[PDB]
Symmetry: C2
Subunit: 70 residues, 2 copies
Amino acid sequence: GSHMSDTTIVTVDHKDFDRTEKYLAEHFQLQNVDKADGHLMINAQKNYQVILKALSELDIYPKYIETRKS
Amino acid sequence: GSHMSDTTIVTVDHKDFDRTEKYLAEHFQLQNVDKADGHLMINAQKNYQVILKALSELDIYPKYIETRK
């Protein structure tokens, strides 16, 4: 069976948060949403290219992206 | 003396390795590479925006980016 022990955390500028949340809601599963600090958590991704390219199409560039144990 | 304390590692598709290496080494300090697995190691960056926007202008979208000691 599965071992879903890791999360990917995307951090964006406040002005980009709502549109980043919309993108991740439509294409991934949001586990946590912290608008106050600019963080969005999804299931752990091994390859960031899909997300980075789609955010770039929205003119959004994360301040940070990290995968770690939840 | 000084030493390297921390590194930002940018990982790209093999086809993007040379152009990424040129961009990063021109605008940041290159510390090391791993060409076999498409990694470029630069002095650590607190905010990835500038690099991710500049790479997108070159039509480069990293497979991975991380910072480590």
